[PDB]
Amino acid sequence: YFLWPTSNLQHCAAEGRANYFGNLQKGLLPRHPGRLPKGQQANSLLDLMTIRAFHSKILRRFSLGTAVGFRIRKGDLTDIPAILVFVARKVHKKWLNPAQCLPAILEGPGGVWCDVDVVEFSYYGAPAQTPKEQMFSELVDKLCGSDECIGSGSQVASHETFGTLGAIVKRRTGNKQVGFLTNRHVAVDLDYPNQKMFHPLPPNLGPGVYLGAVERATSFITDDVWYGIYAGTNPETFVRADGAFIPFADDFDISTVTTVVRGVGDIGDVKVIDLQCPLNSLIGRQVCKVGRSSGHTTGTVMAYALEYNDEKGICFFTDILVVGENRQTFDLEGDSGSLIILTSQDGEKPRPIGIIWGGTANRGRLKLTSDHGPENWTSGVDLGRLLDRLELDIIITNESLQDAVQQQ
Amino acid sequence: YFLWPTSNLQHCAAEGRANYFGNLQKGLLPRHPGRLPKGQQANSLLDLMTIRAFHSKILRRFSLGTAVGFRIRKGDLTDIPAILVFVARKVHKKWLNPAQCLPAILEGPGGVWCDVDVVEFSYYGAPAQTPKEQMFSELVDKLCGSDECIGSGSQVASHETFGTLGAIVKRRTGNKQVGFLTNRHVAVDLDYPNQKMFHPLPPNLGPGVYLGAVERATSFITDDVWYGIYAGTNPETFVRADGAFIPFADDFDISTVTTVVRGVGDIGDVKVIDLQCPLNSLIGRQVCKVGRSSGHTTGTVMAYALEYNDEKGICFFTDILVVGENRQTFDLEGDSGSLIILTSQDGEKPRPIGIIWGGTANRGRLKLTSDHGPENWTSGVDLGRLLDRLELDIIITNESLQDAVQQQ
Amino acid sequence: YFLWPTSNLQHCAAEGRANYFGNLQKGLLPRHPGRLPKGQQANSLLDLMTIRAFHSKILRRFSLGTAVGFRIRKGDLTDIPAILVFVARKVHKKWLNPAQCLPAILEGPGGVWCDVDVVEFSYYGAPAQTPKEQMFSELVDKLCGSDECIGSGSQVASHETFGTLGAIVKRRTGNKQVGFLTNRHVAVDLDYPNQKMFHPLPPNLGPGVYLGAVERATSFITDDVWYGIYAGTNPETFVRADGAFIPFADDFDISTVTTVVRGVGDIGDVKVIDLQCPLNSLIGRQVCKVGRSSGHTTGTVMAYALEYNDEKGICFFTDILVVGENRQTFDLEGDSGSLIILTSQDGEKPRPIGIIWGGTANRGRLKLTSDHGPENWTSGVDLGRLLDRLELDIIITNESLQDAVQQQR
Amino acid sequence: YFLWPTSNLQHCAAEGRANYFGNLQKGLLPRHPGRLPKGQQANSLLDLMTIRAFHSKILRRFSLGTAVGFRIRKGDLTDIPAILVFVARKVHKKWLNPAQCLPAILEGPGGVWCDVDVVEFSYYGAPAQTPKEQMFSELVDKLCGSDECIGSGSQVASHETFGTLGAIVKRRTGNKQVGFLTNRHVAVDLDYPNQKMFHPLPPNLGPGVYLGAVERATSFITDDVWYGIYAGTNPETFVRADGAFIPFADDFDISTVTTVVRGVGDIGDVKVIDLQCPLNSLIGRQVCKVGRSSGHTTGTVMAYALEYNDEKGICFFTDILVVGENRQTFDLEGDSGSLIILTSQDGEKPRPIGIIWGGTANRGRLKLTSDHGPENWTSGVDLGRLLDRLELDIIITNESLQDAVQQQ
Ligand SMILES: Nc1ncnc2c1ncn2[C@@H]1O[C@H](COP(=O)(O)OP(=O)(O)OP(=O)(O)O)[C@@H](O)[C@H]1O
Ligand SMILES: Nc1ncnc2c1ncn2[C@@H]1O[C@H](COP(=O)(O)OP(=O)(O)OP(=O)(O)O)[C@@H](O)[C@H]1O
Ligand SMILES: Nc1ncnc2c1ncn2[C@@H]1O[C@H](COP(=O)(O)OP(=O)(O)OP(=O)(O)O)[C@@H](O)[C@H]1O
Ligand SMILES: Nc1ncnc2c1ncn2[C@@H]1O[C@H](COP(=O)(O)OP(=O)(O)OP(=O)(O)O)[C@@H](O)[C@H]1O
Ligand SMILES: [Mg+2]
Ligand SMILES: [Mg+2]
Ligand SMILES: [Mg+2]
Ligand SMILES: [Mg+2]
Ligand SMILES: [Mg+2]
Ligand SMILES: [N+]
């Protein structure tokens, strides 16, 4: 059976959204000489997303998507909170018509103001789901079945597509069995009754071991349940929370599963993305990931809450937007599901924050410097939130690995 | 959010299937010395599937699919219970390997025997979800948006696909709302939260009106639940029962909905396919369906319980197999969701028995006559068993239609 | 281990061809521009072929190809010996510059003359390896595997190609082994070391029985060896005599082979094509063939010795040209190797004359009638000559087939 | 007028093949001493092939190809005699069921034994007729018409395909004709009655001079005739000995022919590949070639007698296997027919051992190192055995070119 709400998304959820922005458009103090009293400057992700949600009506016009974060000036990433507006071709102010040129400052409910930054930006197509790696290193070999262990970054293959093993997780409800976590597009086939996963390839392709089958997956969680707020005025707003849980099979040796992210080391617990924390603790932070296509790479969290409006009137959100450092691409086709791990803040081990999303528009390009060409951007989703909606707890040590084995 | 059996539901259901056959296996009880003790001749559908499921190993050995029905000797259909074994190309025994030659009589549990027929038979692919080929008539004209009412046969369209409305159904339990029934592949999309239906076209493709959204759908149901017995030795056995229920929108005029099959007339309640009934009460019966692609097309039921072992070790079952009578096709691409109705024979109401299926093993060909080329066949889903899973009831009179809409 | 003749064999043959055609010109004493005696009109295929070979200079210049036969006038065959000239698009005289145009009569060596008929012509692409056979009748079903026996018309398949069993034959010399004849393109693959035949499909494509492997075949024969005469001025002229002989394996049930042409009946021995015989005894004759692809069709022998000069100065000849009757096609793709058989006209048994060639770039369209579209033509290899160069003998009665098995060494 | 062996001769050869291995199986008496002795280890390439031909049943199980040579541990060639088994993907031993896993040692008849090395392998498919993506150097320009002479490496071309001249060879008997040697696919073609050669292009493609026409070619030689022993259990074994001899035209200016392999220098006579000599005489020896597409390239002989069984059932053998140096490619598409030469070790003249084979699977890919991508390999036929079967003799000095041209 499949189910969708009957009267939930009509005149119970839309009127709650129509109530949220109803008040807003009465109690407004224009205050637009361009002085902007600095005590109402955005401080966290929640402030930036609330201003964008209010002014989303004038943001959709002549723009193919928006996001929140810091303003990018001359390629470099500043530490000024701004709303990133993505345009197809960024031209000089003189060649724009007045009704197209975006403002530099936007003020929202309660005088909360922020900057507006235009960024040349484009989307990629869907991956073809059996990609080429093109990274030749001793790590990719280990990741693609040449290693004697299965861990974060190892290639996981369904009957038609393969990706990467994000993390080793265990359930919370009842039997709380132990498995691994990846995104929905790697381990789920709607037109197929079961979803058997293999390492490194399924039997019809080559040699491999049977890892198990998907027990639960999510595709679409609304914005009010994902973030907890109304991220946009569109009543059909969804957050692409693609993730699939595959518990290790009964006739499968779990002792061949390591918890160390090969190429990174021992990692810490999941770091929740708190929408009220200062933006600099997530925006601009140096992250890394270990998948198979691209081995071990490192990048930068450029923006959050990437909003895209598809052909019809449905708003789709994606949580994380990472851009690789040193002009290197952060990921490649086939790194879907990889663990997004923020580099270790001084002492404590690195903590993961997301998994690489693998949907149609999971990758793309955007130009930062005029001296170089466009650079690839990689999209991710909130790990702390996905683990909440999948009832999964991450495993971080090999000793905790043996404890859940005798816990089912 | 989607769920799957944890594993244990499979582990403690696989044994029951093996335990079912192993029991009759140990005491083989041949009871067949070459000549078959008569009377043991299969009598109904259940008898035939029990012989095929017991001999599933040796039948799928050199076969692309099997189905139960009557033997087809020299093109015409007989009244002899047989297991139709589909081969890629039927040739003379003199050029056949002694091991690849299928037998004529197969023993069964307790001595229930039957014949074995060989049919040259092939498959097609997918209808690519927007078919352009169609018939031309005033009926099809009305069904594709020219009619002044919505009913069985009108064109339903998701955001990407074309289809045909099967029947105006009302839910049994719960809200007891009234909507329509069609194929799952017509109504449901994996990578989309909403499943909106329209007539005759979506707002992005052309003009139309909003009918509603899918409230429930079924994709795969196990054989022992769908039929009532283990129909094979493969522990991964499923039935392609793809149906979707779309309740009419709250702001929709039910007055423009009719419970009459345009081109067929007034119909009765659904004829439940009884596995204990004599074979000729469904096999050989002349049926008819009205969709959009082909319109009103009369056919004849040829086989039941079409088995299909894919290249990945999974068994699939499609219930009804229809071949267009008098050297014509029974349906075209886009008729997915039409009502398979039994033609009135002595004055009773034409009772519907199935709905046109959609997918990959959908519309292939088979050779019956020598003087003609291959003839198209069509897959179908058991309407009686589909309604007993979605918990729906078909409406037959416009006066009963208003009683259902007032009980919501 | 293949071999090719030496440059001496070429220059010896080369000058030999130059000498023959040269002495024709050296005494010509060209004639008056008036009447020609009826007694000197072309009478045989050899007359038409000699006149065409003499004027090969002015014929290949503005033509796709040429052939010998009767003049097609207003879409019908006449009794006028003529040299068919094939053009891509036949237009009125007013739109051709006189150098492009063609004369009505050609006068060959020795006062022998004939007509010149212009025909609109076109070639097709390559045969489809695995073609479509949309005939759908009981004869085709039996020819493709549903028959208890195997004979002329049965589908013979290599590991990647479908074909048609031409005739049950036996070798004249050697060990007198019994086999079957077919087209070379159907049964011969050169990038592979053996040519195994199967009826109806090879193991990698479906059920079937292993008939045997190709024991010998011929691709090209020179015109002076095939026709016996010099048919063209080009010293690089060859006849596409594509045939393959496949003797049944050491352990194959020959009792399942019949020498009956299903749909035609009992046939007689091969009707040899005599180049010095009258033209009407092969040109215009009604013929038939039983081919897997198209079943049993009937046609008309429209021309003979079809010439075609490719882009590298090589001249190629195909023997028979057949067009189906009643605006119908005579063959489809996959009928390659089917036995072209003269229909009985006065009680005699139907005797074959050729096999359908079916390869590289055979088959195409032919503009006969203006109110209709272009009709399909089909090429063929002279059966009488193909057996002479393959040293084969056609078996025509199942009684001769029984004894021919015992006469093997 | 082609001719093939009478099926009487085929059955006789198959019986002798079963009698050869039937003798090796009747005696046997393995009595393996556990780890086995060290003087019973193979030394010659004749002993390596007989171990593979004996164990060809178990080797074919899950191997696309096999080849004798040295064991490649960790990415490079060791001095251990081993039979290289080729797989599609080298996965760890833990992800392989014991039926598919390969043993490390194999003992054959007489107590001889050698190792087994697994190599990741793939075939490049059929190359191009008129190939592109070739090098640019003054050496390449001379080989493609810009030089005033023609010799080894010069561009020879039929009317459809390109290639290179292997060696200036003359017939041992007959008219003692003088010509050149090249690959069979480069020169000959089925659907023509004449194979005329040109340099650098045929008249239809561009400028060039008529060199000659193919007088003889051998398509396939059986392994018992080529090697002198049965190299496989399958009764259909053939060696891809594809060579052709093209004697110069009677009018061609033979003074423009040079016996100097431009790039290598003055070469010596053919180095017959002794099968009963220690493996280090061929395996590991550095080789070189002068082409056109690729020019002067060096390489390393990696294996011998590369066995490839297709899905139809035929076994095919290729003599020489060479990969490129410095992780480069040994040749490009278009180098078919160029003479492979053993580089001088002791300052002696270079000895040609093989010629580049130009059939469908003439090139391919294989992985050696984990930190780098897969390298390209090239096929070749035994030159000494090719000249023996074609009844030809290589000319190594321009003085012998005049002594050979006068004897005609
Ligand atoms: N709708 C639009 N479409 C295209 N270009 C636009 C649009 N609105 C503004 N721009 C361009 O973008 C400029 C503002 O870009 P942005 O806000 O990113 O500037 P910045 O961060 O101060 O500097 P930098 O461009 O170096 O990052 C405008 O001056 C104009 O040239
Ligand atoms: N695996 C197979 N693949 C292909 N053909 C087969 C196979 N097994 C049997 N056959 C062929 O099919 C025949 C059986 O046909 P079938 O059981 O349908 O007979 P029928 O119904 O009496 O007659 P008909 O097929 O003429 O309607 C066998 O005699 C043989 O020629
Ligand atoms: N080189 C040429 N290319 C195209 N058309 C030509 C050429 N030479 C002649 N023709 C045309 O073909 C005509 C000759 O027709 P043809 O030889 O078929 O005679 P016919 O049999 O009496 O007539 P038809 O068959 O056309 O009724 C010329 O009158 C001229 O119009
Ligand atoms: N059928 C197979 N398919 C893929 N890999 C296999 C197969 N059988 C064995 N292997 C792999 O090959 C390994 C054996 O090593 P191999 O034969 O390559 O020797 P080696 O050259 O000394 O080793 P290395 O690969 O470290 O250089 C096994 O440990 C296993 O990982
Ligand atoms: Mg900027
Ligand atoms: Mg039958
Ligand atoms: Mg004419
Ligand atoms: Mg005409
Ligand atoms: Mg190795
Ligand atoms: N032998």
Neighbours of ion ligand 6 (CB under 5 A): B 72-73, 117
Which residue pairs from B16-21 have beta carbons closer than 8 angstroms and sit at least 24 positions apart in sequence? Answer: B16/B230, B17/B224, B17/B230, B17/B233, B17/B235, B17/B237, B18/B233, B18/B235, B20/B230, B21/B53, B21/B54, B21/B230, B21/B233
Helix, strand, coil % (nearest 5) of chain B?
20, 30, 50
User: Does the C-beta of A22 come closer than 6 Å to ligand 4?
Assistant: no
Two structure tokens written together for D160:
């459809």
Dihedral sign for Cα B166, B169, B173, B177, please: positive
Whether the CB-CB separation of A161 and A269 falls below 8 Å is answered with no
Residue A361: closest CA among chain B residues belongs to which residue?
B191
| Side-chain half-sphere CA neighbours of B99 within 13 A | 4
CB-based touch D/C (3+ pairs, under 8 A)? yes
Say if the Cβ atoms of A207 and D94 lie within 8 Å: no
Residue A343 sits at the chain D interface (C-beta within 8 Å): no
The rounded distance, in Å, linking the Cα atoms of C319 and C315 is: 13
Of B95, B372, B373, the CB nearest to C207: B95
In chain C, breaks (C-N over 2.5 A) are found after none
**Which of chain C's residues have a Cβ under 8 Å away from the Cβ of B91?**
145-146, 200, 206-208
The rounded distance, in Å, linking the Cα atoms of A337 and A152 is: 10
The Cβ of residue A325 has, within 10 Å, a number of other Cβ atoms equal to: 15
Portion 13-52 of C in contact with D at CB < 8 A: none
Whether the CB-CB separation of C166 and C355 falls below 8 Å is answered with yes
Whether the CB-CB separation of B126 and B361 falls below 8 Å is answered with no
Contacts of residue B277, Cβ cutoff 8 Å, sequence gap at least 6: B44, B45
CA of A80 to the centre of ligand 5 (A): 11
Mutate to test the pocket of ligand 1, among A61, A79, A118 (most ligand atoms within 8 A of CB): A118
Whether the CB-CB separation of D363 and D124 falls below 8 Å is answered with yes
SS (H, E, C) chain C: CEECCCHHHHHHHHHHHHHHHHHHHHCCCCCCCCCCCHHHECCEHHHHHHHHHHCHHHHHHHCCEEEEEEEEECCEEEEEEEEEEEECCCCCHHHCCCCCCCCCEEECCCCCEEEEEEEEECCCCCCCCCCCCCCCCHHHHHHHHHCCCECCCCCCECCCCECCCCEEEEECCCCCCEEEEECHHHHCCCCCCCCEEEEECCCCCCCEEEEEECCEEECCEEHHHHCCCCCCCCCCEEECCCEEEEECCCCCCHHHECCCECCCECCCCCCCCCCCCEHHHCCCCEEEEEECCCEEEEEEEEEEEEEEECCCCCEEEEEEEEEECCCCCCCCCCCCCCEEEECCCCCCCCCEEEEECCCCCCCEEEECCCCCCCEEEEEEEEHHHHHHHHCEEECCCHHHHHHHHHCCC
Dihedral in degrees, nearest 10, Cα atoms A131, A134, A140, A146? 70
Say if the Cβ atoms of B4 and A213 lie within 8 Å: yes
Residue B368: closest CA among chain C residues belongs to which residue?
C136
Q: Which ligand is nearest to the CA of C366?
A: 8
CB-based touch D/B (3+ pairs, under 8 A)? no
Atom of ligand 4 nearest to the CA of D115: 17
**Which of chain D's residues have a Cβ under 8 Å away from the Cβ of A136?**
370-373
CA angle, B75 then B81 then B83, to 5°:
75
User: Does the C-beta of C100 come closer than 6 Å to ligand 3?
Assistant: yes
Residue D213 sits at the chain C interface (C-beta within 8 Å): yes
Of C1, C190, C203, the CB nearest to D190: C190
Contacts of residue D232, Cβ cutoff 8 Å, sequence gap at least 6: D53, D56, D223, D307, D315, D317
Residue C134 sits at the chain B interface (C-beta within 8 Å): yes
DSSP state of A83: E
Dihedral sign for Cα D111, D115, D119, D125, please: negative
Of A6, A10, A216, the CB nearest to B3: A216
A46 to A241, B122, B402, C94: CA distances (angstroms): 19, 58, 50, 87
* Helix/strand number for chain A, H first, E second: 8, 21
Residue A203 sits at the chain D interface (C-beta within 8 Å): no
The rounded distance, in Å, linking the Cα atoms of B134 and B139 is: 12
The rounded distance, in Å, linking the Cα atoms of D272 and D351 is: 9
User: Does the C-beta of D343 come closer than 6 Å to ligand 4?
Assistant: no
Residue A315: closest CA among chain B residues belongs to which residue?
B193
Residue B100 sits at the chain C interface (C-beta within 8 Å): yes
Of A136, A137, A208, the CB nearest to D95: A208
C90 to C69, C76, C78: CA distances (angstroms): 19, 17, 19
- Residues framing ligand 1 (Cβ under 6 A): A 62, 71-74, 87, 90-93, 96, 100-102, 117-118
A44 to A50, A68, A282, B375, C17: CA distances (angstroms): 10, 10, 10, 67, 98
DSSP state of A382: E
Q: Which of D92, D96, D119 to mutate to test the interface with A (most CBs of A within 10 A)?
A: D92
Dihedral sign for Cα B396, B400, B402, B403, please: negative
Residue A16's nearest CA partner among A230, A166, A298, A186 is: A230
The rounded distance, in Å, linking the Cα atoms of C240 and C380 is: 9
Two structure tokens written together for B318:
């499609």
Say if the Cβ atoms of C2 and D250 lie within 8 Å: no
Residue B372 sits at the chain C interface (C-beta within 8 Å): yes
Q: Which residues pair with D351 in a beta bridge?
A: D342
Of A138, A148, A201, the CB nearest to D92: A148
Dihedral sign for Cα B70, B73, B76, B78, please: negative
| Radius of gyration of the CA atoms of chain B, in A | 22
**Which of chain D's residues have a Cβ under 8 Å away from the Cβ of C191?**
359-360
Residue B283's nearest CA partner among B3, B53, B68 is: B68
Residue A207: closest CA among chain D residues belongs to which residue?
D96
CB-based touch B/C (3+ pairs, under 8 A)? yes
Say if the Cβ atoms of A2 and B359 lie within 8 Å: no
Say if the Cβ atoms of D193 and C312 lie within 8 Å: no
Residue D101 sits at the chain A interface (C-beta within 8 Å): no
Q: Which residues pair with B315 in a beta bridge?
A: B237, B309
Of D90, D91, D371, the CB nearest to A208: D91
What was the experiment behind these coordinates? Answer: X-ray
Look up tokens 């096609």; give the residue.
Answer: C329
Two structure tokens written together for A179:
């498995």
Report how many Cβ contacts below 8 Å link chain C to chain D. Answer: 90
Portion 230-289 of D in contact with C at CB < 8 A: 236, 238, 247, 249-250
Dihedral in degrees, nearest 10, Cα atoms C295, C298, C304, C310? -40
Residue A325 sits at the chain B interface (C-beta within 8 Å): no
DSSP assignments along A116-182, one per residue = EEEEEEEE-----SS------SHHHHIIIIISSSB-TT-EEE-SS-EEE--EEEEE-STT--EEEEE
**Which of chain A's residues have a Cβ under 8 Å away from the Cβ of D95?**
145, 199-200, 207-209
